[PDB]
Design a protein around this ligand. Sequence first.
Ligand code: NI
Length: 341
Amino acid sequence: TCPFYKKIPGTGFTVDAFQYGVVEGCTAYFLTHFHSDHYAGLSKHFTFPVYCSEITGNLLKNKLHVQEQYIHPLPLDTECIVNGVKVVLLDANHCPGAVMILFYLPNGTVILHTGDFRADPSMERSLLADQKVHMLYLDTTYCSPEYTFPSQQEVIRFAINTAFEAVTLNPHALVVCGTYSIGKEKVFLAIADVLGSKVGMSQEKYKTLQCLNIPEINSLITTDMCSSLVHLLPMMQINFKGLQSHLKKCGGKYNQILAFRPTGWTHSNKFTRIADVIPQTKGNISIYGIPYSEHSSYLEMKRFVQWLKPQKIIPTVNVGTWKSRSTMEKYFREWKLEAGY
Ligand code: NI
């Protein structure tokens, strides 16, 4: 059964609620983004209306085979009426297609659901500038001050410079990048662009990327592994065994691998600056863990919420323990006493 923090009071709507069967009184199911924890339950057998972005809609149709008649894509930044209620979708700065949803309730209340997001100062000049929010349903993934990490731009600068140096020193090195879901595509796209290569991958992954409305994509990716010196592999293969195994398949073209494992936050962020990051190495294989996050840092979250000044906050992540819930409520009260709302 569907938890409270996935329901929108005074509407027939739910958000990211597909794993509970038929939800009593739900006339429209919203999907914030195409990540498995959030879509859990959708398939070709689904027969209720799904509201989402264009990109999420392309993924539902081609990857999960949801029938076209039940897919309702909405443009961003545009007032839309759904089942008699005004809604707006806003870019969440998470993975491709990910949105926040603004709901203008019939009684005058205004609710923002962030989905998953990476807060940014640019969001302070969206359609949120105008107005009051009475309830914030907040992505609290990294809601504690210990969670620090660099900007995406600094992390990509590090990856580009590391890959370009290694291949210029050795033209016979291969570069490998781990993936398991959508999101973080700048990591392998930026590396391939500096090396003058297309990105090689399986047919399954190529199909997923073809759904994402990325400009000039046909010029950037391929299923012909032999033509490419940047390869994508499932994330589970990014280890010395899996990489040795991969180098055997490449027909003596290559004598070295440099691999990247994008992660979220790890505890080595508590000590090591991005500049100072070093790899794990065995023989002719080196593996870099790089902290490329698509969720808000503590400081980014705090800034956004202090700007928005919501009357009530409902967390949607880390809700399962008394200690987590208590910790988050403590920080929401500090932020409010500090800023005066
Ligand atoms: Ni997500």
